[PDB]
Amino acid sequence: VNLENKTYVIMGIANKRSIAFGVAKVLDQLGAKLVFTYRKERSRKELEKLLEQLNQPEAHLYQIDVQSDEEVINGFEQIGKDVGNIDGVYHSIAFANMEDLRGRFSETSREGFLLAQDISSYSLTIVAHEAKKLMPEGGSIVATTYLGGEFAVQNYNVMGVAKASLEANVKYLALDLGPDNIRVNAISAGPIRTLSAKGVGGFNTILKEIEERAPLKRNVDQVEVGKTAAYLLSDLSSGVTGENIHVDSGFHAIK
Amino acid sequence: NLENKTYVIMGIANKRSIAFGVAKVLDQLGAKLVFTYRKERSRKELEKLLEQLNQPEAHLYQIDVQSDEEVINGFEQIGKDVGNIDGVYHSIAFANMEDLRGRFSETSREGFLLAQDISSYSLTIVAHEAKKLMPEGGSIVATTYLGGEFAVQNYNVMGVAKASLEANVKYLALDLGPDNIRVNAISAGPIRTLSAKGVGGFNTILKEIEERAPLKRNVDQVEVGKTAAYLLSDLSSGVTGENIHVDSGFHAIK
Amino acid sequence: NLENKTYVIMGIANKRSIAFGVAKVLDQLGAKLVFTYRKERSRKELEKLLEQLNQPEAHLYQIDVQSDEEVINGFEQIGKDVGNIDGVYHSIAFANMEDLRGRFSETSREGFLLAQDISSYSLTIVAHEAKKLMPEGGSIVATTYLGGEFAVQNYNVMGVAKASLEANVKYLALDLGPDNIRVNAISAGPIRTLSAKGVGGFNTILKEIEERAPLKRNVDQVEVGKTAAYLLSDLSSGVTGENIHVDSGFHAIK
Amino acid sequence: VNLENKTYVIMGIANKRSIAFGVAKVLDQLGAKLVFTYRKERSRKELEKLLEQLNQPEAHLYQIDVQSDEEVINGFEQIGKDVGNIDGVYHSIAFANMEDLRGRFSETSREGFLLAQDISSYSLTIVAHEAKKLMPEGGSIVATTYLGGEFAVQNYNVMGVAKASLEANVKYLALDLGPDNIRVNAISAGPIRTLSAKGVGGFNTILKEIEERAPLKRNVDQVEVGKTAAYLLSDLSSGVTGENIHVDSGFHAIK
Numbered sequence A, D: 001v002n003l004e005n006k007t008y009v010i011m012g013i014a015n016k017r018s019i020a021f022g023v024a025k026v027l028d029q030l031g032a033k034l035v036f037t038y039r040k041e042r043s044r045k046e047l048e049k050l051l052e053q054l055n056q057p058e059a060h061l062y063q064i065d066v067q068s069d070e071e072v073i074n075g076f077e078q079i080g081k082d083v084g085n086i087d088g089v090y091h092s093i094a095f096a097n098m099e100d101l102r103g104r105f106s107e108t109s110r111e112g113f114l115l116a117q118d119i120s121s122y123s124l125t126i127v128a129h130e131a132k133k134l135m136p137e138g139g140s141i142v143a144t145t146y147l148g149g150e151f152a153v154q155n156y157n158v159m160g161v162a163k164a165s166l167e168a169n170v171k172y173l174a175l176d177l178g179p180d181n182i183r184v185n186a187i188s189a190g191p192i193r194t195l196s197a198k199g200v201g202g203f204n205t206i207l208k209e210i211e212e213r214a215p216l217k218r219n220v221d222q223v224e225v226g227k228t229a230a231y232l233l234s235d236l237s238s239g240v241t242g243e244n245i246h247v248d249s250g251f252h253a254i255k
Numbered sequence B, C: 001n002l003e004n005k006t007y008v009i010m011g012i013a014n015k016r017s018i019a020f021g022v023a024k025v026l027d028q029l030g031a032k033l034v035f036t037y038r039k040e041r042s043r044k045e046l047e048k049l050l051e052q053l054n055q056p057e058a059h060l061y062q063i064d065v066q067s068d069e070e071v072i073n074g075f076e077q078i079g080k081d082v083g084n085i086d087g088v089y090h091s092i093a094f095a096n097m098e099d100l101r102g103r104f105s106e107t108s109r110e111g112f113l114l115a116q117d118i119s120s121y122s123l124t125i126v127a128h129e130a131k132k133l134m135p136e137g138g139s140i141v142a143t144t145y146l147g148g149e150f151a152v153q154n155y156n157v158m159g160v161a162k163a164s165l166e167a168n169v170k171y172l173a174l175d176l177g178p179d180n181i182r183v184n185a186i187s188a189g190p191i192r193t194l195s196a197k198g199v200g201g202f203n204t205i206l207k208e209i210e211e212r213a214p215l216k217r218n219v220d221q222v223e224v225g226k227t228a229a230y231l232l233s234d235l236s237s238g239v240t241g242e243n244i245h246v247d248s249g250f251h252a253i254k
């Protein structure tokens, strides 16, 4: 691709291992202007330090907790005032309690079920609504999912039902916003060592199964997710919406 | 033959409810049935509808599935009243008109989370409570629609709630499998019911089935009920985590 | 209850055939059964396995599905001998043994087309001839495996033939639905049979089911048979173009 | 997606409307060296005229009928001697007799069913076996499918079963060749007016349905397929194998 003169919002960098920082490095290398969103103070401090690795001439950082309508609304409105219109959004945001994740699925609390839906699925819908205002000639929105949204995976529990909700959200958003020339798609990433992965029980056995069974016989990394994001966020994928691309060494295709 | 079987049926409002098709079939097969409801008006309908069944007695429980206490205490009383059960038919969903009748991107946070709560989470907590009355095993069936698998015009917030429900069925199947409790869904084709008045363009959905589905006709509540009898019985003993389309073959075409 | 129903069962070779689990179930339910075989050996095997069914007489027809004339003439004779039928169970597949181990990219043209011919095209031509014996409608069921949906090690050429068969089921559903003929598939979990010996690594396939499937056990032929009875009966009115997994839930997990 | 110093073999150009020619135009624009295979001499003649629109300094044209083991085997052997090792193959080849693309599917002949399997699915398998010989360090193999392989579509009939067969071929090949660092993927193209499309009954009503019902409300073109091929054929799609990308205006995702 070639992304000079384009601007993308990346939501959900926490540190150097985040899937979303792989996305940022790829887009930055390709010429894009980037805008970053975070929830914790600590995530902002990591962003400021990670920006030194990038070619970005200015820091554009906005605090946006996606539990709050007003923060998503005011945040995107401020972004539009600061950088003008945008070309797409990369959504790399999910959350569930340890306490629900690490017990039987049938014991999941209502509170923890709805928390995981709210942050990991509904956030895309409201982000799309606000981001559309900054994309009057169209644009591209990408969210990050996992195969536990399509099949029951041991231990992924409440988050597999949130990812199923997220993948349907992508399809319904693609149908709604398609007439505005806004494409919406998902990347189904293979397991990658991150801060959030520490919440998944048996994560090391999940990585070891990919090496042993997946067609490519190896795990993927953040930058490979980034390279598919660049495709999805750019005019290379102009015909493609409502799609879920598995960046997982082909694990999705085998049993 | 379901004699000496007992099933709980959740979600009859009136004679057109999909769950009443399920009841008629199970009743005809000899099952003892227990019914749950939310509104007073639904209990009144159930009382009238039971005169068409062969049930020697009315076993009726109010359970609003938005309340943990109601589900917990509801299934507790069912166990005291009738003993162990063999399965549960879940036929419950809800969403606001306000969110089936605005653009999907304009869905409210409270409307999205309401539909998830009633239409998806309810299965999880009902399974947790019902398992206490199934020590030997049993069978749980929920009702979904093809808009959980593909984006269908107007179905909007309910399609994301059914995608959530269908994953719920798979994760419950994995969890409760070792306890010998199967969990499955029936993906029913469109049927004129009270809830169907919330879906915009409903008559256009029905016509498209008669015109394009393999059987070239719509299904009815009794056909759902006949597939529920298979899922709830020993005929399906090998089958869990599955979604059977009772929809004249519409799911298979494009 | 299948009394006064008549079904043709294709693909019994011995006591371990999936189609023999089917036959035991349909028979127990009071169906009249017709059997087709390829080689005399399966005829004799059949003749003795029949001793264990309550079929008061032996309707046995040699049909090699590689031959149009045999399929055509065989179904014509069935009709003269017994009259109109209510359905067909198809349990027929083949691939050369060297094609069910090692490297898929080394598959010969001849063995790729052989597998397609026997394991997929044979459904098409059987449907066409059996339709003639179903003027009021009926039900056709074929046996498939999860290897038609996902690349499974060793299954190789048979995985591509099963993918072909599953699409075959869907196109036949669409074509034949207006004639009130339903066409569905059962995706059986691994079961030790004669043909099962041909598949590289079969024993490791079984183990993985016990360890990882939701029910934590393997299925058997009779469980495939009970789901066949559902698909072949009026209980599954409204269901066509479907693939029901009878696999302890293995399809639903990763 | 800079492809200078890459070489790709493109199979299945017949004329300017061919999907494989949209692929050719994109890969050539990106700097790749291109080799073309054809069956009919009239296709050779059209390639010769079409090369005048590309930046290729030489015509590398090989006649390969994929019904012939020898022609596939010798053609790829000849290709390796002329240009050396390659980076990937784009497979744009299918065939069925016209009477099997309208009316009733249950009436399909054995001979027409096996013909469509042979040309449209098995050809991928033998091409991958022969192409792997020219890709010692890895590579990428892309085939062209349709949604009729995943769902029963009116009139598509015998070709639907041949595309289901192709899509499983792609998966099994992905698994087999993954340890060799060969990726295998499909593109599921939406309907495009081509010489082959003339054999599909009701084709004009298929096109119209996409415009009326697909998320983007417009049909796709050959160049859009090409842009996705450039992605799948390049290092951008590392970590992606056994996948089927729909380039169809989102129509796959709706019902």
Ligand SMILES: NC(=O)c1ccc[n+]([C@@H]2O[C@H](COP(=O)([O-])OP(=O)(O)OC[C@H]3O[C@@H](n4cnc5c(N)ncnc54)[C@H](OP(=O)(O)O)[C@@H]3O)[C@@H](O)[C@H]2O)c1
Residues within 6 Å of the ligand: A011, A012, A013, A014, A015, A017, A018, A019, A020, A038, A039, A040, A041, A043, A064, A065, A066, A067, A092, A093, A094, A095, A119, A144, A145, A146, A188, A189, A190, A191, A192, A193, A194, A195, A196, A197
């Ligand atoms: N790692 C994997 O193996 C894997 C595989 C497939 C998919 N995914 C998906 O990839 C995405 C990114 O996760 P990751 O693995 O890169 O882990 P990560 O670095 O921990 O990133 C997760 C991000 O989510 C943000 N987040 C959580 N709740 C939020 C809220 N209410 N408002 C705003 N942001 C919030 C966190 O921000 P703060 O830290 O500031 O709170 C953090 O930046 C997630 O959707 C995840 O499910 C991960």
Ligand SMILES: NC(=O)c1ccc[n+]([C@@H]2O[C@H](COP(=O)([O-])OP(=O)(O)OC[C@H]3O[C@@H](n4cnc5c(N)ncnc54)[C@H](OP(=O)(O)O)[C@@H]3O)[C@@H](O)[C@H]2O)c1
Residues within 6 Å of the ligand: B010, B011, B012, B013, B014, B016, B017, B018, B019, B037, B038, B039, B040, B042, B063, B064, B065, B066, B090, B091, B092, B093, B094, B118, B143, B144, B145, B187, B188, B189, B190, B191, B192, B193, B194, B195, B196
């Ligand atoms: N009709 C169709 O075309 C169709 C097709 C496919 C799937 N479905 C699904 O089929 C199921 C049955 O619906 P239906 O069409 O038969 O309509 P229905 O007759 O309106 O039944 C819907 C039921 O949901 C119950 N319910 C709603 N909220 C509840 C709550 N908070 N607590 C307890 N019960 C609650 C209602 O009870 P009250 O009236 O007492 O409040 C009512 O009995 C639903 O899951 C629906 O999504 C319907």
Ligand SMILES: NC(=O)c1ccc[n+]([C@@H]2O[C@H](COP(=O)([O-])OP(=O)(O)OC[C@H]3O[C@@H](n4cnc5c(N)ncnc54)[C@H](OP(=O)(O)O)[C@@H]3O)[C@@H](O)[C@H]2O)c1
Residues within 6 Å of the ligand: C011, C012, C013, C014, C016, C017, C018, C019, C037, C038, C039, C042, C063, C064, C065, C066, C090, C091, C092, C093, C094, C118, C143, C144, C145, C146, C187, C188, C189, C190, C191, C192, C193, C194, C195, C196
């Ligand atoms: N066993 C499993 O784990 C499993 C799992 C899923 C699906 N399946 C499927 O189940 C079906 C039956 O296999 P099985 O396991 O039951 O093995 P089986 O007992 O060996 O049955 C295979 C049958 O195919 C028949 N057959 C082969 N070619 C024929 C031809 N050209 N014309 C007529 N009949 C022909 C054989 O008849 P002859 O012996 O007379 O030649 C034999 O009766 C197959 O479709 C298989 O792919 C099996």
Ligand SMILES: NC(=O)c1ccc[n+]([C@@H]2O[C@H](COP(=O)([O-])OP(=O)(O)OC[C@H]3O[C@@H](n4cnc5c(N)ncnc54)[C@H](OP(=O)(O)O)[C@@H]3O)[C@@H](O)[C@H]2O)c1
Residues within 6 Å of the ligand: D011, D012, D013, D014, D015, D017, D018, D019, D020, D038, D039, D040, D041, D043, D064, D065, D066, D067, D091, D092, D093, D094, D095, D119, D144, D145, D146, D188, D189, D190, D191, D192, D193, D194, D195, D196, D197
């Ligand atoms: N057009 C569409 O709407 C569409 C949509 C989705 C997928 N597809 C797929 O796209 C691919 C390309 O088709 P197209 O639409 O671009 O039509 P096309 O221009 O007619 O191309 C079809 C190609 O197949 C080649 N072919 C047929 N038999 C062959 C053989 N035995 N050996 C070698 N080559 C052979 C033809 O070569 P000769 O002319 O030299 O015989 C021709 O170049 C096909 O796989 C098709 O199924 C098309």
Ligand SMILES: CCc1ccc(Oc2ccccc2)c(O)c1
Residues within 6 Å of the ligand: A094, A095, A096, A145, A146, A156, A159, A190, A191, A192, A194, A196, A197, A198, A199, A200, A206
């Ligand atoms: C097993 C691969 C995987 C690892 C990390 C993930 O991110 C999470 C997980 C749970 C809560 C929040 C984010 C994820 O979705 C999938």
Ligand SMILES: CCc1ccc(Oc2ccccc2)c(O)c1
Residues within 6 Å of the ligand: B093, B094, B095, B100, B144, B145, B158, B189, B190, B191, B195, B196, B198, B199, B205
């Ligand atoms: C289009 C077929 C259809 C009709 C009715 C439904 O039930 C609902 C719908 C919305 C809210 C609550 C229940 C449903 O799920 C699917």
Ligand SMILES: CCc1ccc(Oc2ccccc2)c(O)c1
Residues within 6 Å of the ligand: C093, C094, C095, C100, C144, C145, C155, C158, C189, C190, C191, C195, C196, C198, C199, C202, C205
């Ligand atoms: C691995 C489960 C399985 C076992 C047996 C099968 O029947 C065959 C296998 C190969 C050739 C012919 C029939 C089958 O299809 C799948």
Ligand SMILES: CCc1ccc(Oc2ccccc2)c(O)c1
Residues within 6 Å of the ligand: D094, D095, D096, D101, D145, D146, D159, D190, D191, D192, D196, D197, D198, D199, D200, D206
């Ligand atoms: C309806 C979209 C469509 C158009 C053309 C195609 O190419 C063919 C069709 C039949 C025989 C050979 C090639 C194809 O596969 C799909």
Ligand SMILES: N[C@@H](CCC(=O)O)C(=O)O
Residues within 6 Å of the ligand: A102, A197, A198, A199, A200, A201, A202, A203, A204
């Ligand atoms: N001991 C944890 C593993 C922690 C992790 O892998 O994230 C478990 O298996 O529950």
Ligand SMILES: N[C@@H](CCC(=O)O)C(=O)O
Residues within 6 Å of the ligand: B196, B197, B198, B199, B200, B201, B202, B203, B204
């Ligand atoms: N009147 C609704 C649709 C009515 C229906 O459910 O058929 C509309 O806005 O189209």
Ligand SMILES: N[C@@H](CCC(=O)O)C(=O)O
Residues within 6 Å of the ligand: D086, D087, D088, D138, D139, D140, D181, D182, D183, D233, D234, D235, D237, D238, D239
């Ligand atoms: N085919 C490209 C890269 C594709 C791959 O990632 O295998 C190459 O030969 O460099």
Ligand SMILES: N[C@@H](CCC(=O)O)C(=O)O
Residues within 6 Å of the ligand: D102, D197, D198, D199, D200, D201, D202, D203, D204
């Ligand atoms: N309309 C013709 C063919 C359409 C075309 O492919 O040009 C038919 O339906 O038979």
